[PDB]
């Protein structure tokens, strides 16, 4: 798995690969690793597929309840804190989750990394999963806060592509989302075979 | 039960036209020691259902107690409903699975024979809650030594007569005596027919040792 | 540790050494191992010292309540039953090995009680790391219905065997003589060992120790 | 004491435009012995939904009973039968409820969605699940899946007209892949139970496989 | 008075007034009839509408494939009891893989509803039940009461003005065993109609039916699904 | 006058009026009789049929509480069924703990103490039922016990509970049951039930018969249908003449 | 008074506390729900008690879920627990089954709490008395638009048009006089506002009433002051 | 430890050695392993001393209360059932092999084995403890039906003597108890009263 | 059943806990008891009249030891007193188990009074219908305390309880003297009992206990006989 996210002038970019494995066997190439919590709030999944899916679904339920009770969408920070407190109860029991919570709230774009080990940190760029080091290299060399939207799309696509090239446990298709002030949009889904064709002549 | 203490060896079962037959030797072994040589490992559950058990004998006695009390409780109501062999098999499957899930299993493999509504029932339940039905069954070493003979015969002859099934189980018990070091040449044969459940007591197989002279 | 007890013609004699160690270093030279249970019942303790102390204190207090309510002298069998049922409840995790001895309306009684809650009723018993040597003395010399002085000498010889042959036992010999008409708590009964005389003088004269700071706080007296 | 044992079993599901096939082998094994040759791994849940379960047979039995009970309770409380997607979501929650003492079961649900199109949901033991056009699970899944990728998904094939999968071709493919699996996976064999879900209902078919 | 407020107070006459008041709760409800033949068990419930714009309250509920019930009295207590019955049937199918026999379910209901009639601060369940079931002994109609007593009936009617229905059923019960399903339902409908006032009449809106049988899982007919059964019904006297 | 509202309150005369009121509930019920003979115990019940709508055998007042123990009840039927469940649990638990059939006297004592526990508190009310327990065993003979709402348990040779207990007792006292068999006693029980039945007030009734004895090999069971038909014929013939 | 327990039946077979709680309903502000083919319309008189009060703080219509709204009448503070239970119910249903709960199921789950009160054999957290509020659940599920009425007794029923609260008698009579099954959502909104204007005491204006709708297309929608003004102008 | 019980017409004969060891140290050489549970019901204990003492005391209490309640002498089978329930319920925590032998008026003299694990079986004769392994053959060869009480006492004494000669964990004196309708007669064989079998020489 | 959770002792409009006053009425109707604190000990005496000669007067004692150094007596209801004696012995043993020292008399009195107070506020119980005189010896000093049904306790030099206790207190005021020794205190206590005694006093009609350095002990009938012969 390789997921990445970064804030820039025009919002938040979120990209992921689509491969899921069981041991060395490739269980799937079409897994959706970007959870749509609400129209302004996205979660990403890395690690145990069942753990991430279940706990981010629980997060979506709690966020909806919060909105119903308080007549306002939950903030990104509050949502990530909810998730972190939920998973802290099971520390050391074997939960495997590395999640990015990405949204746009009253404070602007928000990007938090939350994992089952207990970390919860805000940041401008993150990458999670077995292929995250490879993606970090490319994203760091290409990242500026003032990227144009299409430049940002290209950066995310290329970072995920390189990660799938080097990491045995990443592959399938790059799924790309853009969180803006008026909610996120699914940008695209490009198979890495097509990208390999595009990035090599 | 984490550690079985006194245990019973294979239990055999065979369906036949109009009933079911089950066989079990009368031995409780304490490790290698043939400690208790006159114990019954077959129980009549009710007029249509019988049960034979291998594995820990104290667990079998407990299960026999609980099943006997259940059958008594049902008979008290006198409402014209009685547990079928299938219902008892399902109940035992649930009991075994529940105990396994608590990591406190009942260390038994059970063969449930029965005859209700003009149909034979032969069910298997092991200590993990694995259960199924089959024309013939054998627990423990029987699974390796008896089941092939039963299944050869039934594959070539799906429906047996009571006499044929009885001869078959006798042959299987003789093989188990020859080759299972925890076996004993004293066994019971329980038969369930429309007439009910009949447990025939201490039987022995005739053995042959001519190959002992075939030593060079 | 060596503790022992015997039944003699008219009562019980209990005995103990007075050494307590931590590892292979003597912590207490004058440990008292014979514990009051009731005026007619005593208990020597080996094993974990805190466990022995607490268990015997608890049973002594419970027996005191029982005697207050009944208005009768407690029975040794009651003490044994309470101790053994508690120890069994704790499945041997209370490391108390005990020699319980007393005289009640039914005569003298001696029990050995083991940490797991098993008990034995016997005319003589030994316990502790020095138990085997004391038991050798008993097997060699015990006779039924000894007189008080013979029993005292026998128990003393047994404890001495433990003292001189077991590294875990040492120092003094304490005895407790129980009869229907008396209780003699003899502490110490014998002192076989003594520190040698100090040949030299190592007296630190005043001013020998250098001092950085000093503070004298006067205390108001009545 | 181990609370688990592997009893074999290979299951397969294929979603069509207006059908879903769920197939399984009927062998029940343990260690190197065969408990029985007549233990199909498919269970009808509703007129539109079938489930295939393989793995630890004790867990398979218990889980299927729990699912049946949940379906009946849903029908009682909501006055309608559960859809295939609702069943998949519910099953995910049931499996995760044992996240720290898992059901050792691989599940594939094959049915019709509310639009009448074939839907296949694939599950892992702790409840991770996704919708697929086709999926294999159990002992021979690694043998079955690549051939389905090639023949249903047309992967790695050029100059091939991607054409919708007809029921007849799907049946032939199911039978052929199970025949190939029976040759190489010791656990797979003795018979092939196929359940075809259409709006007409659930039809059942059985095909012999080799017995060694 | 001092004897008519708690279930734990015996009156000097040997009665428990709170239980009788719960009986009244049942007697207020809308009529429902149950009857059976050698092969079928039928419940027919007259449903009330609180207002001309409101739907009629459902009176027949599912319990299991082989068991349905008709309720009369407090509907929340009815739902409590129905949920308990459903869980009992589910437990039976889970443990023994067989349908719970109807009589055993009724016995369990009896125990459950008797418990509160003896404990301080508790109240009786304020609902009467007609239970239609089919099992190995054939079809069954049972009647359960707030007193926790239950009865095994050839036919029964409970609810307001149910005495007229009981009169009809007593008159005609000789014919029920050898009735086909259609005639059985028609007899049930005539009995239920006897409870109606002159102005009111049975329609497809205020009638619900429930049928269970050997080859027929418990099915509830409402609205136009009732028209086939009402079509052959004659005109009341 | 305020003293009769809770079982935890003595009246100034030392009576517990709630128990007496429960006993009145028992007294307003149709009668049941048990008779102990040399060979076993026979129970008869005058089950009043309150409408022809009820299936024959509805609201049975004879129960099997154990293979060897039968129970006949009078009073609040729901309370009686609760006590029958208690008795069954007691017998099953006794078999589980001690490994043999519960003696009838011990079972009666246990159930009587359960009944008594409900006579001491404001939290609960006394049971509104009286009942008889009958058993027969080779080792113990035939045993017949009766328990009432106060929890008092006594062994009897002949017992009647219900609204016609005194007349039924007068009739039972005419039999020399100590030297009779169950076969004659069933006829006598049917006759007594028919005699004490009030034909005007009580309308119609079913006769419920059960027994436990040597002829049943110690198992309590309903009397066979032919035996009951003979017994009812005898009772009607005795009435008519 | 305390002469009786909360679970005491009257000689007429009714629980005293439930009947008293219904009497309490009859003191609430009037609410009206109308169910049509195009959706459900809920309306409720706000009953402003002082010009210093802020009308926007009077919440008589609340969103249970995107497709379910609830109007309430009676002791409004009691309604909060029921509303929260309904919201948690719909979200639990979505979490488990990945689908939207039907209006009838939500109403049933709420009604299951009505009689869950008592004193003895009750753990802490147990309710001591019934809820003194009546609810109109309006929503849109696969079965179209649905209007349900629940009262303190736990009885719930589907309704085409229902009035609850103090003036529910005249409101119900007028609703019967005006309702037909083919009426449009605009027609229903106008009729409900006319009935409210009739039964209210203060002059009906855009601040002293609440109006929401649920439609198959749009989610639960609360009318703004300008939409309310437009509807009121044509009355 | 070696424990034995044998049924004879009208009663039972129980026997035990008297050795209690901790490792290879003999903590008690005159142990009494035959415990009266009731007037005519005894148990022979083998295994952990603490466990068998606790279980026998609990059973003694339960059985005495039961007998008082029923007003009748307890059945040997009832005592065996109580022992079985305790030994099965706590089989993971107890190390106790019990032989329950006694007389009651209903079934005469009875012997029941309750070995480790908590099963229960009636037997014509039972042996147990570490030393019983060494006498199985002997008992199987020497036992015969219809033995009188005197013959059963001699048989038990011989069997225990052999076990004691071979088993390091057995020894001391032989405690015997005969139980019949008339009551319990206890005796101790020690020293030269213990049956002797010569050690083969050359 | 489970017990009632509401208090049966509540405040009246006048500010009185009337159940406590009624328990005190029960105390005032009890058999007379007397305590005298001497320079070197304490004497507790109490009338022990049996209803008939059939009563085995030496089977139940009114003067009870709590610990080697603490004894007590009561006026009021006997069974309540047995409850409090059992509680006091338990409390003393718990103190000894924690501190390995005999509980001081004041500490024992405070703990017992705490229990008695608890029975004036807890749900579904009445107060104890007894007043206690607790005598003790510690720190080389004698202690005499009284503890009431309300849970209030007082330290006394001499006091009387039970029937006719006001006259007894006046008599003790006249006779008492701080300097008198233990034997003179015993004589004075017996004389105080004589004032309110019906019929002739014997060693079997009254019970006496004494606490001093040696400890608390109930006097024997022979010792009481000697003291009575001296009193005449
Ligand atoms: O790719 C994956 N994560 C990416 C995809 C989504 C988010 C990122 C993981 C990668 C494996 C590491 C996770 O560690 C586990 C933690 C808990 C439980 C299990 C595994 C169970 C099981 N285990 C456990 C070890 C052996 C085995 O096989 C297993 O690996 N399950 C697959 C399920 C994924 N698919 C199947 C269902 O259908 C949809 C997709 C799975 O979790 N993969």
Domain boundaries, chain B: 1-216
Selected residue of A26, A30, A50, A90 to mutate for chain D interface (largest D Cβ count, 10 A): A50
Instruction: Give the pairing type, strands G156-158 and H3-8.
Output: unpaired
Count of domains forming chain E: 1
Please tell me if residue F113 touches chain H, with a CB cutoff of 8 Å. Answer: no
> Strands A183-191 and A173-180, how do they pair?
antiparallel
- Beta strand ranges found along chain E (DSSP E): 32-36, 40-46, 60-64, 67-73, 127-135, 138-144, 150-153, 155-158, 207-213, 219-222
Q: What is the CA radius of gyration of chain B?
A: 17
What kind and span of H or E run contains B61? helix B57-77
Integer Cα distance of B207 and B178 in angstroms: 8
What CATH topology corresponds to H1-202? 3.60.20
Output Rg (C-alpha) for chain G, integer angstroms. 18
> Cα separation of G204 and I188, whole Å?
94
Second CATH level (architecture) for the domain B1-216 = 4-Layer Sandwich (3.60)
C-alpha A120 – ligand 1 centre gap (Å): 23
Domains in chain C, please, with CATH?
Answer: 1-220 (3.60.20.10)
Q: Compute CA distances C38 → C123, C148, I152, whole Å.
A: 20, 21, 34
- Which of C77, C85, C67, C122 is CA-nearest to residue C103? C77
Ligand 1 site, residue A144, Cβ cutoff 6 A: no
CB C140 within 8 A of CB C3: no
Contact partners, residue D13, CB within 8 Å, separation at least 6:
D20, D21, D22, D23, D52, D108, D109, D110, D120, D122, D132, D134, D135, D136
**CB-CB contact of E45 with E60 (8 Å):** yes
Q: Is F124 on the interface with I (CB under 8 A)?
A: yes
Q: Which helix (H) or strand (E) holds G112?
A: none
3-state secondary structure of H38: strand
Contacts of B147 (CB under 8 A, 6+ apart): B136, B137, B138, D33
CA triple H138-H141-H143, angle to 5 deg:
95
Give me the residue label for tokens 């219900």. F162
Question: Is the separation of the CB atoms in A138 and A162 below 8 Å?
Answer: yes
Q: Is A92 in the pocket of ligand 1 (CB under 6 A)?
A: no
CA distance F42 to F63: 13
Per-residue tokens: G56: 């926007």
Q: In chain A, which residues have their Cβ closer than 8 Å to the Cβ of D100?
A: 93-94
Residues I115, I116, I118: CA angle, nearest 5 degrees:
65
CA of A17 relative to ligand 1 center, distance in Å:
15
**Phi, psi angles (nearest 5°) of residue E187:** -60, -45
Who contacts G125 (Cβ-Cβ below 8 Å, separation ≥6)?
none
Tell me if H54 and C88 make a contact (CB, 8 A cut-off): yes
Closest partner CB to B73 (pick from F63, F92, F222): F92
Cα I32 from chain centre: 10
Span from the CA of H95 to the centroid of ligand 1 (angstroms):
45
Give the distance (Å) from ligand 1 centre to CA of residue A30: 14
Best residue among A18, A22, A42 to mutate for probing ligand 1's pocket (most ligand atoms within 8 Å of CB) is: A22
Give the separation between CA C119 and CA C109, rounded to whole angstroms: 13
| Residue count (chain F) | 241
- Report the CATH number at residue E75: 3.60.20.10
Distance from CA of G86 to the nearest CA of A (A): 11
> What is d(CA G92, CA G98) in angstroms, rounded to the nearest whole number?
9
Q: Interior CA angle at C38 toward C35 and C40, to 5°?
A: 105
Contact E94 D65 (CB under 8 A): yes
Closest CA to C60 of C73, C79, C45: C79
CATH of the domain at F42: 3.60.20.10
CA E53 and chain centroid, separation = 26
Q: Say how many C-beta atoms besides its own lie within 10 A of residue F184's C-beta.
A: 15
Chain I residues with CB-CB distance to F122 below 8 A: 1
Number of domains in chain F: 1
Rounded alpha-carbon distances, angstroms, from residue F183 to C186, F38, F132, F228, G139:
84, 11, 20, 10, 72
User: How many interchain CB pairs under 8 A, F with H?
Assistant: 22
- Its domain, for residue G111, covers 3-235
The answer to whether the peptide bond before residue C188 is cis (omega within 30 degrees of 0) is yes
Q: What are phi and psi of I30, to 5 degrees?
A: -80, 175
Mutate to test the pocket of ligand 1, among A49, A55, A56, A116 (most ligand atoms within 8 A of CB): A49
Burial C193-209 (b: 16+ CB within 10 A, else e): eeeeeeeeeeeeeeeee
Which residues does residue B108 pair with via DSSP β-bridges, in sequence order?
B55
CA-CA distance, D194 to D175, in Å (whole number)?
A: 9
Q: Catalytic residue positions of C?
A: 1
**Dist CA I185 CA I39 (whole Å):** 9
**Which experimental technique did the depositors report for determining this structure?**
cryo-EM
φ/ψ of residue C103, rounded to 5: -125, 120
3-state secondary structure of C163: helix
Of the candidates G7, F129, F58, G113, the one whose C-alpha atom is nearest the C-alpha of residue E145 is F58
Residues H163, H132 contacting (CB under 8 angstroms)? yes
Q: Which fold has domain D1-212?
A: 3.60.20
Specify the DSSP element, H or E, that contains G12.
Answer: none
Cα–Cα distance between F196 and F175 in angstroms, integer? Answer: 15
Question: Residue B2 belongs to what H/E stretch?
Answer: none
For ligand 1, whether the C-beta of A137 sits within 6 Å is no
Query: Kind of pairing, strands H20-22 and H25-28?
Result: antiparallel
Structure tokens belonging to residue A142: 């290409």
Ranges of beta strands (E only) in A9-69 are 11-16, 20-22, 25-28, 34-38, 41-44
Report the gap between the CA of B27 and the closest CA in chain H (Å): 12
Question: Hey, are the CB atoms on F97 and H85 less than 8 Å from each other?
Answer: yes
State which residues form the domain around A107: 1-200
Min distance D86 CA to chain G CA atoms (Å):
4
> β-strand B33-36 against B28-30: which pairing, if any?
antiparallel
Q: For residue I116, give Cα distances in angstroms to I5, I23, I151.
A: 18, 12, 5
Domain that holds residue F113: 1-238
Task: Decide if G105 touches D, using CB distance below 8 A.
Answer: yes
Q: Which among E150, E154, E151 is positioned nearest to E171, based on CA atoms?
A: E154
CB atoms A61 and G65 under 8 Å: no
Of A57, A58, A65, the CB nearest to G88: A65
Facing F88 at nearest CB: one of B65, B73, B78:
B73
Secondary structure E strands in chain G: 31-36, 39-45, 61-65, 68-74, 133-141, 144-150, 156-158, 161-164, 209-214, 221-222
* D8 closest CA partner among D190, D187, D183, D181: D187
Residue written as token pair 């007849």: D168
Distance, CA of G42 to CA of G60 (rounded, Å): 10
Tell me E165's DSSP state: H
Q: DSSP labels for A157-190?
A: HHHHHHHHHH-TT--SEEEEEEEETTEEEEEEEE
Atom 38 of ligand 1: nearest residue by CA position: D129
What is the set of domains in chain I, with CATH numbers?
2-231 (3.60.20.10)
Instruction: Kindly give the distance from the C-alpha atom of residue D128 to the centroid of ligand 1, in angstroms, as a whole number.
Output: 7
Domain boundaries, chain H: 1-202
What resolution, expressed in A, was reported for this entry? 2.0
User: Do the beta carbons of residue A104 and residue A181 sit within 8 Å?
Assistant: yes
Do G159 and G149 touch, CB atoms closer than 8 A? yes
- The DSSP symbol for F25 reads H
CA distance G198 to G149: 22
* CA G72/CA B193 separation, integer angstroms: 68
With CA atoms as reference, report the closest residue to E230 among E213, E206, E194: E206
> Cα distance from B41 to chain H (closest Cα, Å)?
12
Element (H, E) at A69: helix A49-70
Q: Find out whether the beta carbon of A130 lies less than 6 Å from any atom of ligand 1.
A: no
Dihedral of CA atoms F134, F136, F137, F140 in degrees, nearest 10, equals 70
CA nearest neighbour of G153 among F43, E29, C196, A94: E29
User: In ligand 1, which atom is closest to the CA atom of A48?
Assistant: 13
Contact F34, F159 (CB under 8 A): yes
- Residues of B whose CB is below 8 A from D7: 130
**Tokens representing B145?**
């030594």
Backbone angles phi, psi at A186, to 5 degrees: -65, 110
Burial (Cβ within 10 Å: 0-12, 13-18, ≥19) of residue F8:
middle
CA distance G137 to G154: 14
Binding site for bortezomib, residues of A?
49
d(CA B178, CA B123): 26
Cross-strand bridge partners of residue E208:
E45, E222
What HEC string does chain I produce?
CCCCCCECCCECCCCCEHHHHHHHHHHHCCCCEEEEECCCCEEEEEECCCCCCCCCCCCCCCCEEEECCEEEEEEECHHHHHHHHHHHHHHHHHHHHHHCCCCCHHHHHHHHHHHHHHCCCCECCCCCCEEEEEEEEECCEEEEEEECCCCCEEECCEEEECCCHHHHHHHHHHHCCCCCCHHHHHHHHHHHHHHCCCCCCCCCCEEEEEECCCCEEECCHHHHHHHHHHHC
What is the distance between the alpha carbons of residues B83 and B90, in angstroms, rounded to a whole number? 10
On the CB side of H119, CA atoms within 13 Å amount to 27
Longest dimension (CA), chain E: 54
Q: Is the dihedral of CA I214, I219, I225, I228 positive or negative?
A: positive
Could you give the CA distance from residue E53 to residue G159 in angstroms, rounded to a whole number? 6
3-state secondary structure at position A64: helix
Which CATH number goes with the domain that contains A21? 3.60.20.10
Q: Is A16 in the pocket of ligand 1 (CB under 6 A)?
A: no
């Amino acid at each position: 798995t390789t997921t990445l996210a970064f804030k820039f002038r025009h919002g938040v970019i979120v990209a992921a690969d689509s491969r899921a494995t069981a041991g060395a066997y490739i269980a799937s190439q079409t897994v959706k690793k970007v959870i749509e919590i609400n129209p302004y709030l996205l979660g990403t999944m890395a690690g145990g597929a069942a753990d991430c899916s279940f706990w981010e679904r629980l997060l979506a339920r709690q966020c909806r309840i919060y909105e119903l009770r308080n007549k306002e969408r939950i903030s990104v920070a509050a949502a990530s804190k909810l998730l972190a407190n939920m998973v802290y109860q099971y520390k050391g029991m074997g939960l495997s989750m590395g999640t990015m919570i990405c949204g746009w709230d009253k404070r602007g774009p928000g990007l938090y990394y939350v994992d089952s080990e207990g970390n919860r940190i805000s940041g401008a760029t993150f990458s999670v999963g077995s292929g995250s080091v490879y993606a970090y290299g490319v994203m760091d060399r290409g990242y500026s806060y003032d990227l144009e939207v299409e430049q940002a799309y290209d950066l995310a696509r290329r970072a995920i592509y390189q990660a799938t090239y080097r990491d045995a446990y990443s592959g399938g298709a790059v799924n790309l989302y853009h969180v803006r002030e008026d909610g996120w949009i699914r940008v695209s889904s490009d198979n890495v075979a097509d990208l390999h064709e595009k990035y090599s002549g | 039960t984490q550690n079985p203490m006194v245990t019973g060896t294979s239990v055999l079962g065979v369906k036949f036209e109009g009933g079911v037959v089950i066989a079990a030797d009368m031995l409780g072994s304490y490790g290698s020691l043939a400690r208790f040589r006159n114990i019954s490992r077959i129980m009549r559950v009710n007029n249509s259902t019988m049960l034979g058990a291998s594995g820990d004998y104290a667990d079998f006695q407990y299960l026999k107690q609980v099943l006997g009390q259940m059958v008594i409780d049902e008979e008290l109501l006198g409402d014209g409903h009685s547990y079928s062999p299938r219902a008892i098999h399902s109940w035992l499957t649930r009991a075994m699975y529940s105990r396994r899930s608590k990591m406190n299993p009942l260390w038994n493999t059970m063969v449930i024979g029965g005859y209700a509504d003009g149909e034979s029932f032969l069910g298997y339940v092991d200590m993990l809650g694995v259960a199924y039905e089959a024309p013939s069954l054998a627990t423990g070493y029987g699974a390796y030594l008896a089941q092939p003979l039963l299944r050869e015969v039934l594959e070539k002859q799906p429906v047996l007569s009571q006499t044929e099934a009885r001869d078959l189980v006798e042959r299987c018990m003789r093989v188990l005596y020859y080759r299972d070091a925890r076996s004993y040449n004293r066994f019971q044969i329980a038969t369930v027919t429309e007439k009910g459940v009949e447990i025939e007591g201490p039987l022995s197989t005739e053995t042959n040792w001519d190959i002992a002279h075939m030593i060079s | 540790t060596t503790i022992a007890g015997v039944v003699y013609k008219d009562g019980i004699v209990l005995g103990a050494d007075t050494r307590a160690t931590e590892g292979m270093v003597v912590a207490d030279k004058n440990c008292s191992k014979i514990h009051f249970i009731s005026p007619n019942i005593y208990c020597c303790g080996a094993g974990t010292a805190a466990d022995t102390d607490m268990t015997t204190q608890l049973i002594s207090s419970n027996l005191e309540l029982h005697s207050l309510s009944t208005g009768r002298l407690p029975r040794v069998v009651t003490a044994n039953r309470m101790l053994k049922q508690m120890l069994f409840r704790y499945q041997g995790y209370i490391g108390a090995a005990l020699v319980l001895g007393g005289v009640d309306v039914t005569g003298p009684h001696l029990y050995s009680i083991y940490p797991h809650g098993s008990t034995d009723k016997l005319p003589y018993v030994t316990m502790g790391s020095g138990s085997l040597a004391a038991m050798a003395v008993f097997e060699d010399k015990f006779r039924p219905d000894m007189e008080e002085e013979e029993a005292k000498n026998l128990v003393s010889e047994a404890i001495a065997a433990g003292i001189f042959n077991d590294l875990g036992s040492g120092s003094n010999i304490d005895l407790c003589v129980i009869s229907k008409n008396k209780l003699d708590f003899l502490r110490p009964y014998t002192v076989p060992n003594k520190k040698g005389t100090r040949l030299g003088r190592y007296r630190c004269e005043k001013g020998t120790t250098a001092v950085l700071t000093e503070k004298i706080t006067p205390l108001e007296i009545e | 004491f181990s609370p688990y044992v592997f009893n074999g079993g290979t299951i397969l599901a294929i979603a069509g435009e207006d059908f879903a096939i769920v197939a399984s082998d009927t062998r029940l094994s343990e260690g190197f012995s065969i408990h029985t040759r007549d233990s199909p791994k498919c269970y009808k849940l509703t007129d539109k939904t079938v489930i295939g379960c393989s793995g630890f047979h004790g867990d398979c039995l218990t889980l299927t009973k729990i699912i049946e009970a949940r379906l009946k309770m849903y029908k009682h409380s909501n006055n309608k039968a559960m859809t295939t997607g609702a069943i998949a979501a519910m099953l995910s929650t049931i499996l995760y409820s044992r996240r720290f003492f898992p059901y050792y079961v691989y599940n594939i649900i094959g049915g019709l969605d509310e639009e009448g199109k074939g839907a296949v949901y694939s599950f892992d033991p702790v409840g991770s699940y996704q919708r697929d056009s086709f999926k294999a699970g159990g002992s021979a899944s690694a043998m079955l899946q690549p051939l389905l990728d090639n023949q249903v998904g047309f992967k790695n094939m050029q100059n091939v007209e991607h054409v919708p999968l007809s029921l007849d071709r799907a049946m032939r493919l199911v039978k052929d892949v199970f025949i190939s699996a029976a040759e190489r996976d010791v656990y797979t064999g003795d018979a092939l139970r196929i359940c075809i879900v259409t709006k007409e209902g659930i039809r059942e078919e059985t095909v012999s496989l080799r017995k060694d | 008075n001092q004897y008519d407020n708690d279930v734990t107070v015996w009156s000097p006459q040997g009665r428990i007034h709170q239980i009788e008041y719960a009986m009244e709760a049942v007697k207020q409800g809308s009529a429902t009839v149950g009857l059976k033949s050698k092969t079928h068990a039928v419940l027919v419930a007259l449903k009330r509408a609180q207002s001309e714009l409101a739907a009629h309250q459902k009176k027949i509920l599912h319990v299991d494939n082989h068991i349905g019930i008709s309720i009369a009295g407090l509907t929340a207590d009815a739902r409590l009891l129905c949920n308990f019955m459903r869980q009992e049937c589910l437990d039976s199918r889970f443990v023994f893989d067989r349908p719970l026999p109807v009589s055993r379910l009724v016995s369990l209901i009896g125990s459950k509803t008797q418990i509160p009639t003896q404990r301080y601060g508790r109240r009786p369940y304020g609902v009467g039940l007609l239970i239609a079931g089919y099992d190995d002994m054939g079809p069954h109609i049972f009647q359960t009461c707030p007193s926790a007593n239950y009865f095994d009936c050839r036919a029964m009617s409970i609810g307001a003005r149910s005495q007229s229905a009981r009169t009809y059923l007593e008159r005609h019960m000789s014919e029920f065993m050898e009735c086909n399903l259609n005639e059985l339902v028609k007899h049930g409908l005539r009995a239920l109609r006897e409870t109606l006032p002159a102005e009111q009449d049975l329609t497809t809106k205020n009638v619900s039916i429930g049928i269970v049988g050997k080859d027929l899982e418990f099915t509830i007919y409402d609205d136009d699904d009732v028209s086939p059964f009402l079509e052959g019904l004659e005109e009341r006297p | 006058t305020g003293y009769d509202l809770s079982a935890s309150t003595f009246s100034p005369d030392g009576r517990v009026f709630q128990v007496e009121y429960a006993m009145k509930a028992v007294e307003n019920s149709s009668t049941a009789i048990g008779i102990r003979c040399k060979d076993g115990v026979v129970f008869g019940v005058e089950k009043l049929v309150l409408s022809k709508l009820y299936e024959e055998g509805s609201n049975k007042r004879l129960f099997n509480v154990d293979r060897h123990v039968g129970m006949a009840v009078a009073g609040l039927l729901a309370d009686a069924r609760s006590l029958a469940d208690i008795a069954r649990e007691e017998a099953s638990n006794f078999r589980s703990n001690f490994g043999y059939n519960i003696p009838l006297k011990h079972l009666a004592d246990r159930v009587a103490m359960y009944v008594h526990a409900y006579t001491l508190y404001s939290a609960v009310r006394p049971f509104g039922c009286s009942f008889m327990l009958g058993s027969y065993s080779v080792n113990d003979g035939a045993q017949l016990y009766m328990i009432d709402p106060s929890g008092v348990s006594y062994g009897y040779w002949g017992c009647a509970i219900g609204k016609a207990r005194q007349a039924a007792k007068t009739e039972i006292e005419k039999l020399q049951m100590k030297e009779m068999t169950c076969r004659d006693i069933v006829k006598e029980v049917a006759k007594i039930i028919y005699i004490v039945h009030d034909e005007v007030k009580d309308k119609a009734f079913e006769l419920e018969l059960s027994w436990v004895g040597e002829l049943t090999n110690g198992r309590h069971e309903i009397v066979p249908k032919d035996i009951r038909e003979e017994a009812e014929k005898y009772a009607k013939e005795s009435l008519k003449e | 008074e305390y002469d009786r327990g909360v679970n005491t039946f009257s000689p007429e077979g009714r629980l005293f506390q439930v009947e008293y709680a219904i009497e309490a309903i009859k003191l609430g502000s009037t609410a009206i729900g109308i169910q049509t083919s195009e959706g459900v319309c809920l309306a409720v008189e706000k009953r402003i008690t002082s010009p210093l009060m802020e009308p926007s703080s009077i919440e008589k219509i609340v969103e249970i879920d995107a497709h379910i709204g609830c109007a309430m009448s009676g002791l409004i503070a009691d309604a909060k627990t029921l509303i929260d239970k309904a919201r948690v119910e719909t979200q639990n249903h979505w979490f488990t089954y990945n689908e939207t709960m039907t209006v009838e199921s939500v109403t049933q789950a709420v009604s299951n709490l009505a009689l869950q009160f008592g004193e003895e054999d009750a753990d802490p957290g147990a309710m001591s008395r019934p809820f003194g509020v009546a609810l109109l659940f309006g929503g849109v599920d696969e079965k179209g638009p649905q209007l349900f009425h629940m009262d303190p007794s736990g009885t719930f029923v589907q309704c085409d048009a229902r009035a609850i609260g103090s003036a529910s008698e005249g409101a119900q009579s007028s609703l019967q006089e005006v309702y037909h099954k083919s009426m449009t959502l605009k027609e229903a909104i106008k009729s409900s506002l006319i009935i409210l204007k009739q039964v209210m005491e203060e002059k009906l204006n855009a601040t002293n009433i609440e109006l929401a709708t649920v439609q198959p297309g749009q989610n639960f929608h609360m009318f703004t002051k300008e939409e309310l003004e437009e509807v009121i102008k044509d009355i | 430890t070696t424990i034995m019980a044998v049924q004879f017409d009208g009663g039972v004969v129980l026997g035990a050695d008297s050795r209690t060891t901790t490792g290879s140290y003999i903590a008690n050489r005159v142990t009494d392993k035959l415990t009266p549970i009731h007037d005519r019901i005894f148990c022979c204990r083998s295994g952990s001393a603490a466990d068998t003492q606790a279980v026998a005391d609990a059973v003694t209490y339960q059985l005495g209360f039961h007998s008082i309640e029923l007003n009748e002498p307890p059945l040997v089978h009832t005592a065996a059932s109580l022992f079985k329930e305790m030994c099965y319920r706590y089989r993971e925590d107890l190390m106790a092999g019990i032989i329950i032998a006694g007389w009651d008026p209903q079934e005469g003299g009875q012997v029941y084995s309750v070995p480790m694990g908590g099963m229960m079986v009636r037997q014509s004769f039972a042996i147990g403890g570490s030393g019983s392994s060494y006498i199985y053959g002997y008992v199987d060869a020497t036992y015969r039906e219809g033995m009188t009480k005197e013959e059963c006492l001699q048989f038990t004494a011989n069997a225990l003597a052999l076990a004691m000669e071979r088993d390091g964990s057995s020894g001391g004196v032989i405690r015997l108890a005969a139980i019949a309708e008339s009551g319990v007669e206890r005796q101790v064989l020690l020293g030269d009263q213990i049956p002797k079998f010569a050690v083969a020489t050359l | 059943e489970r017990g009632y959770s509401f208090s049966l002792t509540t405040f009246s409009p006048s500010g009185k806990l009337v159940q406590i006053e009624y328990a005190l009425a029960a105390v005032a109707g009890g058999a007379p008891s007397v305590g005298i604190k001497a320079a070197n000990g304490v004497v507790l005496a109490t009338e022990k009249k049996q209803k008939s000669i059939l009563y085995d007067e030496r089977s139940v004692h009114k003067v009870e030891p709590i610990t080697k150094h603490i004894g007590l007596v009561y006026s009021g209801m006997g069974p309540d007193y047995r409850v409090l004696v059992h509680r006091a012995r338990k409390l003393a043993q718990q103190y000894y188990l924690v501190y390995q020292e005999p509980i001081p008399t004041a500490q024992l009195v405070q703990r017992v009074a705490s229990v008695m107070q608890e029975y004036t506020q807890s749900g579904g119980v009445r107060p104890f219908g007894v007043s206690l005189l607790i005598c003790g010896w510690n720190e080389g000093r004698p202690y005499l305390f009284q503890s009431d049904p309300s849970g209030a306790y007082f330290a006394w030099k001499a006091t009387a309880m039970g029937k006719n206790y006001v006259n007894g207190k006046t008599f003790l005021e006249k006779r008492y003297n701080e300097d008198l020794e233990l034997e003179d205190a015993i004589h004075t206590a017996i004389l105080t009992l004589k004032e309110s005694f019906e019929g002739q006093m014997t060693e079997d009609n009254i019970e006496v206990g004494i606490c001093n350095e040696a400890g608390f002990r109930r006097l024997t009938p022979t010792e009481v006989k000697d003291y009575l012969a001296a009193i005449a």
